Design a protein around this ligand. Sequence first.
Ligand SMILES: Cc1cc2c3c(c1C)C(C)(C)CC=[N+]3c1c([nH]c(=O)[nH]c1=O)N2C[C@H](O)[C@H](O)[C@H](O)COP(=O)(O)O
Ligand SMILES: Cc1cc2c3c(c1C)C(C)(C)CC=[N+]3c1c([nH]c(=O)[nH]c1=O)N2C[C@H](O)[C@H](O)[C@H](O)COP(=O)(O)O
Ligand SMILES: C=Cc1ccc(O)c(OC)c1
Ligand SMILES: C=Cc1ccc(O)c(OC)c1
Ligand SMILES: C=Cc1ccc(O)c(OC)c1
Ligand SMILES: C=Cc1ccc(O)c(OC)c1
Ligand SMILES: [K+]
Ligand SMILES: [K+]
Ligand SMILES: [K+]
Ligand SMILES: [K+]
Ligand SMILES: [Mn+2]
Ligand SMILES: [Mn+2]
Lengths: 496, 496
Amino acid sequence: QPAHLCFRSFVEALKVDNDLVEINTPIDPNLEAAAITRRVCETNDKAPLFNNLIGMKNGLFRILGAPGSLRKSSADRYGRLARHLALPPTASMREILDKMLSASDMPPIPPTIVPTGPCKENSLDDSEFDLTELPVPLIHKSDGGKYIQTYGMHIVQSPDGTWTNWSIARAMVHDKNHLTGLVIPPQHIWQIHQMWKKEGRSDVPWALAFGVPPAAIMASSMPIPDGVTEAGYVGAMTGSSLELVKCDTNDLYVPATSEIVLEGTLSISETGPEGPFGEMHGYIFPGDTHLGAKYKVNRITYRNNAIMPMSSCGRLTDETHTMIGSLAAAEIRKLCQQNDLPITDAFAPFESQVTWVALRVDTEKLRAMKTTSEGFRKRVGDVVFNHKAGYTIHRLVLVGDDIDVYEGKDVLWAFSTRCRPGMDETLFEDVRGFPLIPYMGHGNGPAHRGGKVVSDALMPTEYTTGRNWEAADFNQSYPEDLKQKVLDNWTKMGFS
Amino acid sequence: QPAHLCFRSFVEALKVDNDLVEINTPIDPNLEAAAITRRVCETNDKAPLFNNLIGMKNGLFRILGAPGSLRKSSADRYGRLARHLALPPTASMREILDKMLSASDMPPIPPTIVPTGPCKENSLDDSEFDLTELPVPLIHKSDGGKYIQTYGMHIVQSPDGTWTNWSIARAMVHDKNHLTGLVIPPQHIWQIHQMWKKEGRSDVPWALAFGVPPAAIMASSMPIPDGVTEAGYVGAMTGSSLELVKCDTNDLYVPATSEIVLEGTLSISETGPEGPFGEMHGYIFPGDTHLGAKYKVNRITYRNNAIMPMSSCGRLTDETHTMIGSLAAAEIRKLCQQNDLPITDAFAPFESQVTWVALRVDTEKLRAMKTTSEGFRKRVGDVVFNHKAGYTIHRLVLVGDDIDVYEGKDVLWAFSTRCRPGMDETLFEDVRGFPLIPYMGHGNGPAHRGGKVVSDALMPTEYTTGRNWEAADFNQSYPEDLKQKVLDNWTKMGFS
Ligand SMILES: Cc1cc2c3c(c1C)C(C)(C)CC=[N+]3c1c([nH]c(=O)[nH]c1=O)N2C[C@H](O)[C@H](O)[C@H](O)COP(=O)(O)O
Ligand SMILES: Cc1cc2c3c(c1C)C(C)(C)CC=[N+]3c1c([nH]c(=O)[nH]c1=O)N2C[C@H](O)[C@H](O)[C@H](O)COP(=O)(O)O
Ligand SMILES: C=Cc1ccc(O)c(OC)c1
Ligand SMILES: C=Cc1ccc(O)c(OC)c1
Ligand SMILES: C=Cc1ccc(O)c(OC)c1
Ligand SMILES: C=Cc1ccc(O)c(OC)c1
Ligand SMILES: [K+]
Ligand SMILES: [K+]
Ligand SMILES: [K+]
Ligand SMILES: [K+]
Ligand SMILES: [Mn+2]
Ligand SMILES: [Mn+2]
């Protein structure tokens, strides 16, 4: 099966790409696997495949770290993400994001039910497994539990059956047959959970599938609209109907080639201790445990020689930057355009810890609007900060056509030089805030409200008559013929 | 003579360091010299020495570009600056800045008058030179003149004789015997000029010396206090009295080994067209010419085979970043400490286009102050933004002890994650602003007032009981023995 449709094939692809290190000697899931993966992510090294994990038994499990992290070279920097999507390994971020958005103006392609698949090769009933006995990793030394779930897909369905959501939300082992995790607004797992809670009759049927089709884990990480079934979006994106098999103990459907599947329920009444966890912004607050959602596991099914993907998240650069930030930016770009805003491109700079999004403006269209900075900033911020796709983002930076938003150096240059602090900014205190940013949940103000800003790095004439400067750089401050002469004589003269 | 005391020896040092490219074929001062230098600065390449400049005659002049720019390797990144100061080429920014501050608690060492020096080897009187005939460079294609003065030292003295100031301020050729340039508040050349204007009796005696002792051009670029004669500060810093010779046509004193010396007057009454110029923030606004100060040149003296240093300034990284920003940061650090603020380190991130300064706080001392963010931010901003050393800086970022302010990635991480927009910031609208930043002089508000901010990236407990997190990074999230094992097995396992 193709790499984008089958996680086991994706691992093969990374090998072929010389983007995998297989470690066949014993590695401890207590910190060691995650420490190696952390170093990989901080250095953009090859993805680690831990084939000999201390405590692996009943055939559960090997670990792949850094599945969505960056490669060292500029030419294939985003190659691991490209391999989730059937794209060439040299694909740009713009091409990746365009692929992820493509299904938003296509009919869904619903999944196809098949009678079995690799994920049924082995099973353990509720007398046979113990989650505390599996080689679940301790990812950061101060974590409040062993985080089994960092790169699987939670599957829940609305009570009426009309929306089945696929998403990534963290979860850790509670005891032999339960997990605790985050289920928080405005996320779709929360929205669905609230539907079940209001009905009040039963716990939520649930499954958690690890090592799903790579195209599916990408949509799982993206804030596509409310009420949209990810399976149909991924079908449209890939041009093919995804093959799903029914769970054994409930009527949910999981990808046929899933590495590992947990079946059970998400409680509408029970909670348990969850966290702390070393998170996307680069921090852990030791001891900050709070009550989280509680999951009961009834059954495990899995492939022969199952592989568990793992994100060792924190400081730059890992899946929480490359996927959470970029995919939110993509959805924001679309949102803006659908609201008649002249936004061509959006990206969450990694340098901002993916807390900013830079919005590139078609300034010809802006000029025709005959507006001002104050008005335009307010409009943009009301659209984005009142929408779920804006949830994680606390600063929007508006830039004109000369800036490549996918280049952090250029966004930083424009922000620092074109946006006057205070005057060229609008603060938003009555919007939903993202509590995981330290200055929110551990800060001086309300954890869940405010702390957002639109920073206008458009210069005045960009609203009126057009750009009135040239950059003082090699590109813009010298005529073409001179530039080319310099380049052509560069190494002759003695330069590198 | 040592490299730090003699510009001709400094050029030799760069050669020996394999940090110089000598170009002996003809190079045009109309854009070509500056284009090559621009590319050098954008790539951190070796400094260019143009030995065969089209239009060089009466022995005037060769050009050295990029005298204070960065080298490619991390180990000697600041080596060119180190060579201005007798420091090892691996010197850190902290050691450079400490050397530049060292004279601030030493007695001055006044200069020594000597009867002649290399700068007297040749002369041209006012019937023999024509500034329009010299190979003065056109540095950026849209510049409003040929900027002769980008790395020389203006020398002016108070009417009472008690303060002689050395500083860099730009100037361009007006006609055969005049320059125009910037003379603006709160700069010391302006302060002195105002003294002469109030006396109202004569033009200001002036000299402009190019290719001065490297230690002298560094102090020329630093905002040491009002009323302090740079020659005595540089004497103290270097531990030696600088050797000066009297001008021929006035009673000012210039470094004995100066490459080129202009003698004349700065008018107290006349102005002429000046600019535009491709400036430190990365911009030129074509056509933005304004009236500037006017200089009359009466005499030129110069060394055999004179070399003119040139800054081809603009986008990162050149002398306007490495020297203006870092040296202002140094002076700010001292200022803060002298005002009883618990600041250990300061640096202007290059990523901010040197418009920010990050201030590292001794948080043990902060805790003893039993204060709050609001109070502390106001205190810091009142001290810095009301002082000349703060003039160029529009954002101060307060960070705790874990952050290395000389590492832009780390400052950006702390700013983005620890400072809540609005709430954790104090805006300053009634302070002097820096008009050359585009969002000031070409922005939406007053060019000369306001637009400043203190951004507090201290977390709440840093004021009270101490840091309450660990980073989610390899360094902080894993025990020492594990880290060392990982490192020791890194290349064995198959990583880079
Ligand atoms: C890629 C990715 C996405 C994480 C994530 C991680 C990764 C690796 C982790 C597992 C390492 C740690 C935590 N994360 C959470 C998370 N969203 C959330 O609500 N809680 C989480 O705990 N997300 C983001 C969530 O997937 C996106 O916001 C989706 O838009 C959610 O899908 P939905 O729109 O269908 O709700
Ligand atoms: C290194 C450096 C410093 C420039 C500078 C440049 C460089 C290369 C240029 C030449 C390429 C272009 C312009 N610059 C000006 C300038 N200060 C100023 O008032 N006007 C200028 O035009 N400075 C900064 C000025 O040197 C510092 O602010 C000093 O503190 C001034 O000395 P003072 O404190 O004695 O006034
Ligand atoms: C290396 C790329 C690549 C792409 C898709 C595949 O299915 C694959 O299988 C080994 C490899
Ligand atoms: C906890 C992580 C996290 C990540 C992204 C989200 O959109 C989110 O919404 C509650 C939560
Ligand atoms: C290479 C360093 C260096 C340092 C000081 C000198 O005077 C010098 O003369 C050639 C060279
Ligand atoms: C024009 C440049 C410039 C650079 C630094 C300064 O402190 C300054 O004060 C007026 C001016
Ligand atoms: K999703
Ligand atoms: K602006
Ligand atoms: K000075
Ligand atoms: K703060
Ligand atoms: Mn969804
Ligand atoms: Mn001075």
